[PDB]
RNA sequence: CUCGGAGCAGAACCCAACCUCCGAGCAGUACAUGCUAAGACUUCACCAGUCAAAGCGAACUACUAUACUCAAUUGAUCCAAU
């Protein structure tokens, strides 16, 4: 009985695995796709500074993150 | 090897400009 | 000693085989879900973090 | 033996060196080899069917 | 009353240079891991591009040229507008593939540089070889 | 060993053979105090038995 | 070591040895590797496989373990389905 | 202690005073080209070529073939340059090349290749296969008479023989169709030999076919000095080389000492050596053409052994050297338990005296 | 002698001759050999089991596509190119 | 007070001083850093440590892909937790 139950548990869990993978992998791609979007935003915030570098380069980005 | 006639056949750094910051 | 960055966690197979392996992850990142080879089923399956073993 | 040294085109550091060498200059390095002593095998009569 | 025809030597001597290679039991020259290109092959396709011509060689690892196709040949040159363009490289691939099959060469390795592999010329030459029947990978040696 | 004992007349095949007869023929030495539980018949010599 | 016990006047076995080493009847001693269950997370697969091996002791250690164990532990045993049965006897050993 | 170099050291001709003004490679491809050239030159130090390169004889290979054809380079170059201008003048040819839609006619290329470089490519390929090594003890010849050999398979299909392509013994069960270009009054000798088939002597060959005193290219009218025997590569013996050799005769020749009976099913009579056959007839015979194919065992070879040669079929197997192990020691310190299995003959339990 | 053997079905006899043609000698006898044991009994038992496996495989007529061996893969390419060199007669 | 690199110790190995200098007690990327197995190396013993063909299973016909980058980046037995 123990062996039969363990094999059945694995079989059931392993019949769900294929669908689990596509969902996981599709979400990993989205996670990676969501990091790239965040990267683009930072570059835009630097252009808004317009080369007015100095001490007031960090807080400017903070102001715009609050807006988002 | 030092004693052998082929000593230094692998020398190369004398052929490149000295780039030492 | 005081410094603390990563942690050691136990990754448990989702195939129900009970096979587990330990991996290192950043403390400030989310729980890991990994595709890892499970010897019991003899093919790569999803593993999900269950417990933190220790601080690395 | 001593042989001419050609690095892999993906080995960035080595490729940067050879491109800066004066034309006509060839790098050499020392290589070690094993000369195989025995053949991979032999064909032997196993049956007369 | 032994049969004269049944006098067979206990060991068979096969002097065919390609025999052990065709059985995929011959040694390949492994090693040379720190230099380029690898020596771990029996035959390799080597493409020589010059200012005026395109030549493709199939050579054994021992350095013997097996078959060759060059735009210097009148047989090929007479049909080419240019001997230095992509069309010339594709033509060399098609001609070489036919000569390979007639010589019995069905497998070879190709060892391009990164820029060569990305070039359209070499991509068209490789497709010509594979369409022509030649496989540009070699079967693994059988050790056991 | 069993065939050897029979050929020399040390074990009698005309009667049932058990531990007592094997021990009485000095064919095997059993040590119950050393956790011996008896004899195991092994195949060695099957071709010529 | 107790060379002569107070009750029997006999040599005693060092039981620490019995808990760690397997004696093959041919004279060889088998052991596990120290640290084979320690800090596996920081050790490579190749190292971990080496640590799992059952290995033989050298001459000096074998002589020492023989002295630290009484004759009982050197007898030939016939355990049923012994995993180590094949290794009790040497084969093709010269000199 | 130092020792002076035995010759010019690499990179000595580089003037190190004007290093900044000297031209650099700048490209991996330019260094590699120079590196490959340097590797091929002879050196006074130890080299890979010294230990692994085939030891060719210093004396050049004797040429035993027909004279090269006489060509007028001036007239040839004029006609060739004119043809290229006509091809390049066409505007559609320029557009097909620019749009990468042009192609060459492979059949026409091969026909011209047969008449130009073909002979030298066949010589190079025959040298690679070891035919000159085995058939003429290193002497070479340029096959200047194209030899076309094809085995009839079925009724509508032919299997051509080129220079190393694989033909099965079933396809070669009957004599092939042979054609070449020959002038009227010329005499020719065709022979087929198996370089690797001999089952007894390592350096001997089997004569599978010998046609002598062929008038022109009418192969069916030549004398059958040795009748056709299909290839019989033994199972497990690998891939064999069968070579067709065409010889141009200066006169009619008497081949009575090479005549084999019809049929000839005795392997001792088929034993043959091309070097000896040619050496005695060299004064009146010259190698002209060459074709060869590669053959491995197939199920039809059993029929040749069982029926035609009236013998049991020899089977061979490729046997590898036994594995090396160091001398077994009484105390294999730090070796795994499986060390003992490396020196065990049998896997079945032993019980000794018991 | 495979052909004479009447304890094997005739269709089975004809399919074994094709599958195990390499084990049948000139006289027509199917020869099996086992040398994997010290004991003649086990060697004979192995040979007898091979006979039982041969008859089972022939009767089973399995149509399952077996995985191609590595040595066979190279021969497949070589056979493909040999067919590709095949020509037709100009005037049939 | 343990570990690594360099000089002393110029060229196989080894080589000391409360000798001369600089470092380490991690980090990052993987998630087949899966399994298994010839033959070897070894810090002068032991312990420990190191490199690996073939094979299985993967990956693969774009990835200097196959024992990850990295110099050291580390702790025996008992015992405890599970
Ligand atoms: K032979
Ligand atoms: Mg040591
Ligand atoms: Mg491997």
Short mmCIF file of N, CA, C and O in Angstrom, two decimals, chain D residues 2-43:
data_model
loop_
_atom_site.label_atom_id
_atom_site.label_comp_id
_atom_site.label_asym_id
_atom_site.label_seq_id
_atom_site.Cartn_x
_atom_site.Cartn_y
_atom_site.Cartn_z
N UNK D 2 58.64 23.09 -29.83
CA UNK D 2 58.32 24.50 -29.94
C UNK D 2 57.43 24.69 -31.16
O UNK D 2 57.79 24.27 -32.27
N UNK D 3 56.28 25.33 -30.97
CA UNK D 3 55.31 25.51 -32.04
C UNK D 3 54.83 26.95 -32.09
O UNK D 3 54.90 27.68 -31.10
N UNK D 4 54.34 27.34 -33.26
CA UNK D 4 53.73 28.65 -33.43
C UNK D 4 52.45 28.72 -32.61
O UNK D 4 51.68 27.75 -32.54
N UNK D 5 52.20 29.87 -31.99
CA UNK D 5 51.07 30.06 -31.10
C UNK D 5 50.01 30.91 -31.80
O UNK D 5 50.24 32.09 -32.09
N UNK D 6 48.85 30.31 -32.07
CA UNK D 6 47.69 31.02 -32.60
C UNK D 6 46.58 30.90 -31.56
O UNK D 6 46.03 29.81 -31.36
N UNK D 7 46.20 31.99 -30.89
CA UNK D 7 45.14 31.89 -29.88
C UNK D 7 43.76 31.77 -30.52
O UNK D 7 43.57 31.98 -31.71
N UNK D 8 42.79 31.41 -29.68
CA UNK D 8 41.41 31.37 -30.14
C UNK D 8 40.90 32.79 -30.38
O UNK D 8 41.17 33.69 -29.57
N UNK D 9 40.17 33.03 -31.47
CA UNK D 9 39.67 34.39 -31.73
C UNK D 9 38.78 34.94 -30.62
O UNK D 9 38.59 36.15 -30.55
N UNK D 10 38.23 34.08 -29.76
CA UNK D 10 37.41 34.54 -28.65
C UNK D 10 38.22 34.90 -27.42
O UNK D 10 37.69 35.56 -26.52
N UNK D 11 39.48 34.48 -27.35
CA UNK D 11 40.36 34.84 -26.24
C UNK D 11 40.80 36.28 -26.44
O UNK D 11 41.78 36.57 -27.13
N UNK D 12 40.06 37.20 -25.82
CA UNK D 12 40.23 38.62 -26.12
C UNK D 12 41.65 39.10 -25.79
O UNK D 12 42.26 39.83 -26.58
N UNK D 13 42.18 38.70 -24.63
CA UNK D 13 43.48 39.21 -24.21
C UNK D 13 44.57 38.78 -25.19
O UNK D 13 45.41 39.60 -25.59
N UNK D 14 44.58 37.51 -25.57
CA UNK D 14 45.61 37.02 -26.49
C UNK D 14 45.47 37.65 -27.87
O UNK D 14 46.47 37.96 -28.52
N UNK D 15 44.23 37.83 -28.34
CA UNK D 15 44.03 38.42 -29.66
C UNK D 15 44.48 39.87 -29.67
O UNK D 15 45.03 40.36 -30.66
N UNK D 16 44.25 40.59 -28.56
CA UNK D 16 44.70 41.98 -28.49
C UNK D 16 46.22 42.06 -28.62
O UNK D 16 46.75 43.03 -29.17
N UNK D 17 46.93 41.06 -28.11
CA UNK D 17 48.39 41.06 -28.19
C UNK D 17 48.86 40.85 -29.63
O UNK D 17 49.70 41.60 -30.14
N UNK D 18 48.33 39.82 -30.30
CA UNK D 18 48.84 39.48 -31.62
C UNK D 18 48.54 40.57 -32.64
O UNK D 18 49.32 40.79 -33.57
N UNK D 19 47.41 41.27 -32.49
CA UNK D 19 47.08 42.33 -33.44
C UNK D 19 48.05 43.50 -33.32
O UNK D 19 48.25 44.24 -34.29
N UNK D 20 48.65 43.69 -32.15
CA UNK D 20 49.60 44.77 -31.92
C UNK D 20 51.03 44.38 -32.26
O UNK D 20 51.94 45.20 -32.09
N UNK D 21 51.26 43.15 -32.73
CA UNK D 21 52.61 42.72 -33.06
C UNK D 21 53.04 43.29 -34.40
O UNK D 21 52.22 43.48 -35.30
N UNK D 22 54.33 43.58 -34.58
CA UNK D 22 54.81 44.01 -35.90
C UNK D 22 54.62 42.90 -36.93
O UNK D 22 54.85 41.72 -36.65
N UNK D 23 54.20 43.29 -38.12
CA UNK D 23 53.99 42.33 -39.19
C UNK D 23 55.27 41.56 -39.47
O UNK D 23 56.36 42.14 -39.55
N UNK D 24 55.14 40.25 -39.63
CA UNK D 24 56.28 39.36 -39.78
C UNK D 24 56.70 38.67 -38.50
O UNK D 24 57.52 37.75 -38.55
N UNK D 25 56.15 39.09 -37.36
CA UNK D 25 56.51 38.52 -36.06
C UNK D 25 55.52 37.42 -35.71
O UNK D 25 54.30 37.60 -35.83
N UNK D 26 56.04 36.28 -35.27
CA UNK D 26 55.24 35.11 -34.92
C UNK D 26 55.59 34.70 -33.50
O UNK D 26 56.77 34.55 -33.16
N UNK D 27 54.57 34.51 -32.67
CA UNK D 27 54.79 34.04 -31.30
C UNK D 27 54.98 32.53 -31.27
O UNK D 27 54.37 31.79 -32.04
N UNK D 28 55.85 32.09 -30.37
CA UNK D 28 56.13 30.67 -30.17
C UNK D 28 55.90 30.31 -28.71
O UNK D 28 56.04 31.14 -27.82
N UNK D 29 55.53 29.05 -28.49
CA UNK D 29 55.37 28.52 -27.15
C UNK D 29 55.81 27.07 -27.14
O UNK D 29 55.98 26.44 -28.19
N UNK D 30 56.02 26.54 -25.94
CA UNK D 30 56.46 25.16 -25.77
C UNK D 30 55.25 24.26 -25.58
O UNK D 30 54.40 24.53 -24.73
N UNK D 31 55.18 23.20 -26.37
CA UNK D 31 54.07 22.26 -26.35
C UNK D 31 54.59 20.87 -26.00
O UNK D 31 55.71 20.50 -26.34
N UNK D 32 53.75 20.10 -25.31
CA UNK D 32 54.06 18.72 -24.96
C UNK D 32 53.06 17.82 -25.66
O UNK D 32 51.86 18.11 -25.71
N UNK D 33 53.55 16.71 -26.21
CA UNK D 33 52.74 15.79 -27.00
C UNK D 33 52.94 14.37 -26.47
O UNK D 33 53.92 14.08 -25.78
N UNK D 34 52.00 13.50 -26.80
CA UNK D 34 52.14 12.06 -26.60
C UNK D 34 52.03 11.40 -27.96
O UNK D 34 51.02 11.55 -28.65
N UNK D 35 53.08 10.68 -28.35
CA UNK D 35 53.09 9.93 -29.61
C UNK D 35 52.49 8.55 -29.33
O UNK D 35 53.14 7.74 -28.64
N UNK D 36 51.29 8.25 -29.82
CA UNK D 36 50.66 6.97 -29.47
C UNK D 36 51.54 5.79 -29.85
O UNK D 36 52.09 5.73 -30.95
N UNK D 37 51.66 4.84 -28.92
CA UNK D 37 52.53 3.69 -29.11
C UNK D 37 51.82 2.51 -29.76
O UNK D 37 52.43 1.78 -30.55
N UNK D 38 50.54 2.30 -29.45
CA UNK D 38 49.83 1.11 -29.89
C UNK D 38 48.70 1.49 -30.84
O UNK D 38 48.14 2.58 -30.75
N UNK D 39 48.34 0.60 -31.77
CA UNK D 39 47.19 0.86 -32.63
C UNK D 39 45.88 0.72 -31.88
O UNK D 39 45.81 0.10 -30.81
N UNK D 40 44.84 1.31 -32.45
CA UNK D 40 43.53 1.27 -31.80
C UNK D 40 43.02 -0.16 -31.66
O UNK D 40 42.24 -0.45 -30.75
N UNK D 41 43.44 -1.06 -32.54
CA UNK D 41 43.03 -2.44 -32.45
C UNK D 41 43.48 -3.21 -33.67
O UNK D 41 44.20 -2.70 -34.53
N UNK D 42 43.03 -4.47 -33.73
CA UNK D 42 43.38 -5.37 -34.82
C UNK D 42 42.17 -6.21 -35.18
O UNK D 42 41.34 -6.53 -34.33
N UNK D 43 42.08 -6.57 -36.46
CA UNK D 43 41.03 -7.46 -36.94
C UNK D 43 41.49 -8.90 -36.80
O UNK D 43 42.52 -9.28 -37.36
#
